[PDB]
Write an enzyme that holds these catalytic residues in place. Structure first.
Site, PDB file in Angstrom:
ATOM      1  N   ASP A 141       4.356  -1.651  -3.171  1.00 41.88           N
ATOM      2  CA  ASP A 141       3.811  -1.219  -1.904  1.00 41.88           C
ATOM      3  C   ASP A 141       2.327  -0.853  -2.064  1.00 41.88           C
ATOM      4  O   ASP A 141       1.795  -0.941  -3.168  1.00 41.88           O
ATOM      5  CB  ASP A 141       4.635  -0.002  -1.475  1.00 41.88           C
ATOM      6  CG  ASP A 141       4.387   0.420  -0.047  1.00 41.88           C
ATOM      7  OD1 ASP A 141       4.012  -0.432   0.794  1.00 41.88           O
ATOM      8  OD2 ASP A 141       4.587   1.622   0.223  1.00 41.88           O
ATOM      9  N   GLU A 186      -2.795  -3.375  -0.778  1.00 45.38           N
ATOM     10  CA  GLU A 186      -3.846  -4.046  -0.039  1.00 45.38           C
ATOM     11  C   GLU A 186      -5.194  -4.138  -0.778  1.00 45.38           C
ATOM     12  O   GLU A 186      -5.878  -5.140  -0.622  1.00 45.38           O
ATOM     13  CB  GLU A 186      -4.011  -3.410   1.338  1.00 45.38           C
ATOM     14  CG  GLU A 186      -2.849  -3.727   2.287  1.00 45.38           C
ATOM     15  CD  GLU A 186      -1.555  -2.992   1.963  1.00 45.38           C
ATOM     16  OE1 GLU A 186      -0.458  -3.550   2.239  1.00 45.38           O
ATOM     17  OE2 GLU A 186      -1.624  -1.858   1.426  1.00 45.38           O
ATOM     18  N   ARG A 211       4.349  -5.881  -0.180  1.00 44.46           N
ATOM     19  CA  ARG A 211       3.822  -5.682   1.153  1.00 44.46           C
ATOM     20  C   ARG A 211       2.627  -6.595   1.391  1.00 44.46           C
ATOM     21  O   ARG A 211       2.648  -7.412   2.315  1.00 44.46           O
ATOM     22  CB  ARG A 211       3.439  -4.238   1.407  1.00 44.46           C
ATOM     23  CG  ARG A 211       3.384  -3.940   2.895  1.00 44.46           C
ATOM     24  CD  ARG A 211       3.237  -2.459   3.181  1.00 44.46           C
ATOM     25  NE  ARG A 211       1.936  -1.947   2.776  1.00 44.46           N
ATOM     26  CZ  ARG A 211       1.530  -0.694   2.981  1.00 44.46           C
ATOM     27  NH1 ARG A 211       2.332   0.188   3.565  1.00 44.46           N
ATOM     28  NH2 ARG A 211       0.325  -0.321   2.593  1.00 44.46           N
ATOM     29  N   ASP A 227       5.775  -1.210   8.142  1.00 46.71           N
ATOM     30  CA  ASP A 227       6.187  -0.047   8.890  1.00 46.71           C
ATOM     31  C   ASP A 227       6.371  -0.333  10.356  1.00 46.71           C
ATOM     32  O   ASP A 227       5.628   0.155  11.211  1.00 46.71           O
ATOM     33  CB  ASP A 227       5.170   1.061   8.675  1.00 46.71           C
ATOM     34  CG  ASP A 227       5.086   1.489   7.226  1.00 46.71           C
ATOM     35  OD1 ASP A 227       6.101   1.353   6.487  1.00 46.71           O
ATOM     36  OD2 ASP A 227       4.000   1.964   6.823  1.00 46.71           O
TER      37      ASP A 227
HETATM   38  C1  LIG Z   1       5.005   6.146   5.337  1.00 43.46           C
HETATM   39  C2  LIG Z   1       3.671   5.468   5.605  1.00 43.46           C
HETATM   40  O1  LIG Z   1       2.680   6.498   5.698  1.00 43.46           O
HETATM   41  C3  LIG Z   1       1.350   6.046   6.000  1.00 43.46           C
HETATM   42  O2  LIG Z   1       1.245   5.531   7.341  1.00 43.46           O
HETATM   43  C4  LIG Z   1       1.341   6.583   8.313  1.00 43.46           C
HETATM   44  C5  LIG Z   1      -0.042   7.043   8.765  1.00 43.46           C
HETATM   45  O3  LIG Z   1      -0.764   7.615   7.674  1.00 43.46           O
HETATM   46  C6  LIG Z   1       0.095   8.086   9.869  1.00 43.46           C
HETATM   47  O4  LIG Z   1      -1.172   8.454  10.413  1.00 43.46           O
HETATM   48  C7  LIG Z   1       0.921   7.518  10.993  1.00 43.46           C
HETATM   49  O5  LIG Z   1       0.287   6.340  11.499  1.00 43.46           O
HETATM   50  C8  LIG Z   1       0.270   6.282  12.921  1.00 43.46           C
HETATM   51  C9  LIG Z   1      -1.111   5.827  13.368  1.00 43.46           C
HETATM   52  O6  LIG Z   1      -2.113   6.740  12.922  1.00 43.46           O
HETATM   53  C10 LIG Z   1      -1.111   5.750  14.886  1.00 43.46           C
HETATM   54  O7  LIG Z   1      -2.402   5.362  15.365  1.00 43.46           O
HETATM   55  C11 LIG Z   1      -0.023   4.771  15.308  1.00 43.46           C
HETATM   56  O8  LIG Z   1      -0.282   3.488  14.714  1.00 43.46           O
HETATM   57  O9  LIG Z   1       1.244   5.272  14.874  1.00 43.46           O
HETATM   58  C12 LIG Z   1       1.352   5.333  13.448  1.00 43.46           C
HETATM   59  C13 LIG Z   1       2.797   5.690  13.076  1.00 43.46           C
HETATM   60  O10 LIG Z   1       3.104   7.093  13.132  1.00 43.46           O
HETATM   61  O11 LIG Z   1       2.193   7.199  10.462  1.00 43.46           O
HETATM   62  C14 LIG Z   1       2.150   6.133   9.521  1.00 43.46           C
HETATM   63  C15 LIG Z   1       3.597   5.782   9.215  1.00 43.46           C
HETATM   64  O12 LIG Z   1       4.402   6.965   9.049  1.00 43.46           O
HETATM   65  C16 LIG Z   1       0.903   4.991   4.996  1.00 43.46           C
HETATM   66  O13 LIG Z   1      -0.410   4.526   5.347  1.00 43.46           O
HETATM   67  C17 LIG Z   1       1.923   3.855   4.945  1.00 43.46           C
HETATM   68  O14 LIG Z   1       1.444   2.883   4.022  1.00 43.46           O
HETATM   69  C18 LIG Z   1       3.280   4.432   4.541  1.00 43.46           C
HETATM   70  N1  LIG Z   1       4.323   3.421   4.353  1.00 43.46           N
HETATM   71  C19 LIG Z   1       4.641   2.871   3.033  1.00 43.46           C
HETATM   72  C20 LIG Z   1       5.029   3.988   2.093  1.00 43.46           C
HETATM   73  C21 LIG Z   1       6.287   4.247   1.714  1.00 43.46           C
HETATM   74  C22 LIG Z   1       6.506   5.414   0.772  1.00 43.46           C
HETATM   75  O15 LIG Z   1       6.426   4.936  -0.571  1.00 43.46           O
HETATM   76  C23 LIG Z   1       7.467   3.430   2.156  1.00 43.46           C
HETATM   77  O16 LIG Z   1       8.500   4.312   2.618  1.00 43.46           O
HETATM   78  C24 LIG Z   1       7.117   2.432   3.259  1.00 43.46           C
HETATM   79  O17 LIG Z   1       8.136   1.430   3.304  1.00 43.46           O
HETATM   80  C25 LIG Z   1       5.741   1.801   3.039  1.00 43.46           C
HETATM   81  O18 LIG Z   1       5.442   0.825   4.037  1.00 43.46           O
END
Ligand SMILES: C[C@H]1O[C@H](O[C@H]2[C@H](O)[C@@H](O)[C@@H](O[C@H]3[C@H](O)[C@@H](O)[C@@H](O)O[C@@H]3CO)O[C@@H]2CO)[C@H](O)[C@@H](O)[C@@H]1N[C@H]1C=C(CO)[C@@H](O)[C@H](O)[C@H]1O
Ligand SMILES: *[C@@H]1O[C@H](CO)[C@@H](O[C@@H]2O[C@H](CO)[C@@H](O[C@@H]3O[C@H](CO)[C@@H](O)[C@H](O)[C@@H]3O)[C@H](O)[C@H]2NC(C)=O)[C@H](O)[C@H]1NC(C)=O
Ligand SMILES: *[C@@H]1O[C@H](CO)[C@@H](O[C@@H]2O[C@H](CO)[C@@H](O[C@@H]3O[C@H](CO)[C@@H](O)[C@H](O)[C@@H]3O)[C@H](O)[C@H]2NC(C)=O)[C@H](O)[C@H]1NC(C)=O
Ligand SMILES: *[C@@H]1O[C@H](CO[C@@H]2O[C@@H](C)[C@@H](O)[C@@H](O)[C@@H]2O)[C@@H](O[C@@H]2O[C@H](CO)[C@@H](O)[C@H](O)[C@H]2NC(C)=O)[C@H](O)[C@H]1NC(C)=O
Ligand SMILES: *[C@@H]1O[C@H](CO[C@@H]2O[C@@H](C)[C@@H](O)[C@@H](O)[C@@H]2O)[C@@H](O[C@@H]2O[C@H](CO)[C@@H](O)[C@H](O)[C@H]2NC(C)=O)[C@H](O)[C@H]1NC(C)=O
Ligand SMILES: *[C@@H]1O[C@H](CO)[C@@H](O[C@@H]2O[C@H](CO)[C@@H](O)[C@H](O)[C@H]2NC(C)=O)[C@H](O)[C@H]1NC(C)=O
Ligand SMILES: [Cl-]
Ligand SMILES: [Cl-]
Ligand SMILES: [Cl-]
Length: 845
Positions: free
Chosen positions: A424, A427, A506, A522
């Site tokens: 993950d 990028e 990813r 996500d």
């Molecule tokens: C879990 C996820 O966290 C991170 O992404 C999060 C953002 O940091 C938050 O600000 C929020 O994003 C929001 C945007 O700001 C908003 O403008 C709108 O687009 O809604 C969004 C959703 O709430 O939330 C995001 C997701 O919770 C991080 O950047 C992302 O890469 C993370 N996901 C990966 C990480 C893990 C943990 O190892 C895995 O569980 C996931 O499968 C990965 O894809």
């Protein structure tokens, strides 16, 4: 002179807002649109490059391109070299380079061609005709050629309004040509339309009136915009490297895909267990809770092959560690999983914690010692922020870092025998802009053309563009970060385990499928996103990444029971099926719902498991022939133009049409059925019966517990008995579903090997069988028989489309002990005792 139709105007001010006087000063035309379309655009006479000294060799053509008048971008390269190679009858390849300086290039490994090529002298252009019908496929004369140090633009007319590709974006399968800007710059951002996402694939497939098609691949890894116009036409705008262009001639869309995969690589063959159900979430805090998932799934008769863990397992969210509170007995947990016939997966991030005391964290200490990290202006490692805090980023273009990654993987595998890697944040994802210490002020960080990336800067959500890697600056290599880690992780798993690797990534780039699979990231737990996953799953199959899927029931927010039933139903047809869930969200494991929801969910997984031998056979074809596993209707029925825009139904291979419900509160669905007979798969026993279509839309009953799946007449599907794992199901008796054409004909095949080993095809360690129905008989053809195909027991043969009840049924010349016929469904169900590897004959009358 400025009399150019609105739709054929090419933007003469792609870099800034411009006034009439300035536009005209650039030597361009200013005509405001009546109501996007450029107000400042190129006249036919605008200065471009000129073709001189065109020459022919055995390989193809060579020429010099000279520009006399500079453009509005700095650092025009006024003298270029053109090279045209006619490599095969299907593939034409041309490059445009600076003959005085090596520039960054992406690292990658009737007897007549189907194409013909010609050149325009001034302004310079390359014209590619499809030989058979004289159609113009590529014509770069439509706009000027730009070749500046940090700006390359090459344009072409398109043969129709139908074009697909240019991942990764959330969009319909067919892209909009209404002044659409498509940006390729890998970026950690939850999937939303109009935004550059995690991966970048500079390839498109263009359909032609009548059903032919062709593909174009621009082998360029720089930040780029691809601009589409309604004329229709297309413009490649890259910020670096060279123009390295391949044209694939088809004529069939499946052949275009196969031809492109010839250049970038055929999909890797996954292990059989990889095609089973995977289950994960951020939030399984301890081995006791993680064991409960397997227990609870097993208790409720839900198959599960692979248990996963997210960040929970690690010590303070660092790679290659596990905490001593909740995960004290991590090794034993994974060993137990194996004892029970299951596999184990866990997340790995690229970024390595840099803030621990010296000598306390081997991955960083070793990495620092061997110089594995991306470095900055002063030569120190670049430090950003991710889950563990301050982090350095591995450079996967550096051979020493490849070796270090192999070691870290092997060492951690000695502690905990995981079976694959979930990679993950590659990028690479950064929580701060560029680095803890910002970025310098140079041309790489502040380029003359910035594509339409989210955030308006290349540094956003990632590391500094001018940072150093072994092959080049990050500016050129950024879109390859994920890919290179995937390559590195592929080799690491081969050395550590000696069996096929299983890597789920990813971030991706073109050619990613040769090494790994992908999940869509996500996605929200919404109906909108469930629907959107169908085009995206199909997109990735067209790009040679068949092992793809979206988080079943969605990742973000809280799912609903209804949505999770529908998502699991469609999800069971993602070639890669994983249910994954965020930390905050409510549980969405199949066993956490009401009984009717569980039944619906159990039926979906049961059917997937029954279908695994076929799914595996499809992956074999992907691996050996560049076929797609999941495909849009148009790939299979290109000559039926009604299929062209269908992207909410999918096919598995040639014969299985899946028509999912994608909206809340519906008890029916309307799907397109190509010409032919389509048998309802619910008539086949698993442990309207037929739709007769002239090529038409059909409204189908589809209550909550049902997903419509139809089998095409003329095809035979291998199936296998049930199990909670592939370790169990692989030992069961097999079956055939035989879908007869009206003339009583059908063909199918089975590929079988040990399911884990390396170099199976090279060593011939596999069995391949073909099945043929003809004239009231069903036989097999032994293409290859080996020890791996031994003991494969055929116990049931289900024949669909049998008009009249048979009086006798024979197997190898002897009446079968028992069979059943249903005059209502036209189904003949036969019990037999046969071996897939032994030549048999079954007949009826
Ligand atoms: C879990 C996820 O966290 C991170 O992404 C999060 C953002 O940091 C938050 O600000 C929020 O994003 C929001 C945007 O700001 C908003 O403008 C709108 O687009 O809604 C969004 C959703 O709430 O939330 C995001 C997701 O919770 C991080 O950047 C992302 O890469 C993370 N996901 C990966 C990480 C893990 C943990 O190892 C895995 O569980 C996931 O499968 C990965 O894809
Ligand atoms: C490839 O693209 C170029 C540019 O779109 C095409 O060349 C252009 O063709 C148009 C229409 O065929 C030309 O306009 C015509 O010019 C003739 C000759 O003087 C004149 O008799 C007509 O009244 C009309 O104005 C245009 O000059 C020409 N432009 C350039 C730069 O070549 C070409 O057709 C395309 N090639 C193929 C195979 O489609
Ligand atoms: C190249 O990367 C290195 C990191 O590998 C950067 O080193 C960092 O430099 C800054 C100041 O230039 C240091 O900040 C200082 O921290 C100390 C306390 O530790 C504080 O007393 C000072 O006032 C200042 O805030 C930072 O500590 C240091 N990072 C590390 C990990 O040592 C370097 O700046 C980068 N070079 C460029 C041109 O960006
Ligand atoms: C296009 O080519 C001509 C001729 O080039 C020569 O023949 C080639 C096949 C190859 O052997 C080259 O190395 C030769 O130079 C170029 O005109 C020549 O230019 C050179 C260098 O300035 C000069 O010494 C000669 O007098 C010229 N010869 C002739 C017959 O005109 C021309 O410059 C090339 N054009 C471009 C844009 O590259
Ligand atoms: C996703 O749901 C959680 C939990 O929701 C609560 O508990 C469920 C069983 C159900 O009864 C819901 O209606 C409840 O609201 C949300 O977290 C809750 O958020 C609320 C309000 O923001 C807060 O007051 C609660 O204490 C939280 N409860 C828990 C257990 O954390 C979360 O916000 C939901 N997410 C989305 C995107 O809707
Ligand atoms: C596995 O299933 C068990 C049994 O239903 C779950 O245990 C229950 O958890 C709830 C919390 O929501 C408690 O109120 C009950 O007392 C528990 N029952 C029993 C018998 O232990 C458990 O939470 C499930 N675990 C997972 C990871 O899904
Ligand atoms: Cl103005
Ligand atoms: Cl370089
Ligand atoms: Cl229609």
């Amino acid at each position: 002179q400025c009399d150019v139709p609105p739709n054929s105007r090419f933007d003469c001010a792609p870099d800034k807002a411009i006034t009439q006087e300035q536009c005209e000063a650039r030597g361009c035309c200013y005509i405001p649109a009546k109501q996007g379309q450029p107000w400042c655009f190129f006249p036919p006479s605008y200065p471009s490059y000129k073709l001189e000294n065109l020459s022919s060799s055995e390989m193809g053509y060579t020429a010099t391109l000279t520009r006399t008048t500079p453009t509005f971008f700095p650092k025009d390269i006024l003298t270029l070299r053109l090279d045209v190679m006619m490599e095969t009858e299907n593939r034409l390849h041309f490059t445009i380079k600076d003959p005085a300086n090596r520039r960054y290039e992406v690292p990658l490994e009737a007897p007549s061609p189907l194409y013909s090529v010609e050149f325009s002298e001034e302004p310079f252009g390359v014209i590619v005709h499809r030989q058979l019908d004289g159609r113009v496929l590529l014509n770069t004369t439509v706009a000027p050629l730009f070749f500046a140090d940090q700006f390359l633009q090459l344009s072409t007319s398109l043969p129709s309004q139908y074009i697909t590709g240019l991942a990764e974006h959330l969009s319909p399968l067919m892209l909009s040509t209404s002044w659409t800007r498509i940006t390729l710059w890998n970026r950690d951002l939850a999937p939303t339309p109009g935004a550059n996402l995690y991966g970048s694939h500079p390839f498109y497939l263009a359909l032609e009136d009548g059903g032919s098609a062709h593909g174009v691949f621009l082998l360029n890894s720089n930040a780029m915009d691809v601009v589409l116009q309604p004329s229709p036409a297309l413009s490649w705008r890259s910020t670096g490297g060279i123009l390295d262009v391949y044209i694939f001639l088809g004529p069939e869309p499946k052949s275009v895909v196969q031809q492109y995969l010839d250049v970038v690589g055929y999909p890797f063959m996954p292990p059989y267990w990889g095609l089973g159900f995977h289950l994960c979430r951020w939030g399984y805090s301890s081995t006791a809770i993680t064991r409960q998932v397997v227990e609870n799934m097993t208790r409720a008769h839900f198959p599960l092959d692979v248990q996963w863990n997210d960040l929970d397992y690690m010590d303070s969210r660092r790679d290659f560690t596990f905490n001593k509170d909740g995960f004290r007995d991590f090794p034993a947990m994974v060993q137990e999983l194996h004892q029970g016939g299951r596999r184990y997966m866990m997340i790995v991030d690229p970024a390595i914690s840099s803030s621990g005391p010296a000598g306390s964290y081997r991955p960083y200490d070793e990495g620092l010692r061997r110089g594995v990290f991306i470095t900055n202006e002063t030569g120190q490692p670049l430090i950003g922020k991710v889950w563990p805090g301050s982090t350095a980023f591995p450079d996967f273009t550096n051979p020493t870092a490849l070796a270090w990654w192999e070691d870290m993987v092997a060492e951690f595998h000695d502690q905990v025998p995981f079976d694959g890697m979930w990679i993950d944040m590659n990028e690479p994802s950064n929580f701060i802009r560029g680095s803890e210490d910002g970025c310098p002020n140079n041309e790489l960080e502040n380029p003359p053309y910035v594509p339409g990336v989210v955030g308006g800067t290349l540094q956003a959500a990632t590391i500094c563009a001018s940072s150093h890697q072994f092959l080049s600056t990050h500016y050129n290599l950024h879109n390859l970060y994920g890919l290179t880690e995937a390559i590195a992780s592929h080799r690491a798993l081969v050395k550590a385990r000696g069996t096929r690797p299983f890597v789920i990534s990813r971030s991706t780039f073109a050619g990613h499928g040769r090494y790994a699979g992908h999940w869509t990231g996500d996605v929200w737990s919404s109906w909108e996103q469930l629907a959107s996953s169908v085009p995206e799953i199909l997109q990735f199959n067209l790009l040679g990444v068949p092992l793809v899927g979206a988080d079943v029931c969605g990742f973000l927010g809280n799912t609903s029971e209804e949505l999770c039933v529908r998502w699991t139903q469609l999800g069971a047809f993602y070639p890669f099926m994983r249910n994954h869930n965020s930390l905050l969200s409510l549980p969405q494991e199949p066993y956490s719902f009401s009984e009717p929801a569980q039944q619906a969910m159990r039926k979906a997984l049961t059917l997937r498991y029954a279908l695994l031998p076929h799914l595996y056979t499809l992956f074999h074809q992907a691996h050996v022939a560049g076929e797609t596993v999941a495909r849009p209707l148009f790939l299979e029925f290109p000559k039926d133009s009604s299929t062209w825009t269908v992207d909410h139904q999918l096919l598995w291979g040639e014969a299985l049409l899946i028509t999912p419900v994608l909206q809340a509160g519906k008890a029916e669905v309307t799907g397109y059925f190509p010409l032919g007979t389509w048998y309802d798969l619910q008539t086949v026993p698993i442990e309207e019966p037929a739709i007769h279509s002239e090529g038409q839309w059909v409204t189908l009953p589809a209550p909550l517990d049902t997903i419509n799946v139809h089998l095409r007449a003329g095809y035979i599907i291998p199936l296998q008995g049930p199990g909670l794992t592939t370790t169990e199901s692989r030992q069961q008796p097999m079956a055939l579903a035989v879908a007869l054409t009206k003339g009583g004909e059908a063909r199918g095949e089975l590929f079988w090997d040990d399911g884990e080993s390396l170099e199976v095809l090279e060593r011939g360690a596999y069995t391949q069988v073909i099945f043929l129905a003809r004239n009231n008989t069903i036989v097999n053809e032994l293409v290859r028989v080996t020890s791996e195909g031994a003991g494969l027991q055929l116990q049931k043969v289900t024949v669909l489309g049998v008009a009249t009840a048979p009086q006798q049924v024979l197997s190898n010349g002897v009446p079968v002990s028992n069979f059943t016929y249903s005059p209502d469904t036209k189904v003949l169900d036969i019990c037999v005792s046969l071996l897939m590897g032994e030549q048999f004959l079954v007949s009826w009358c």
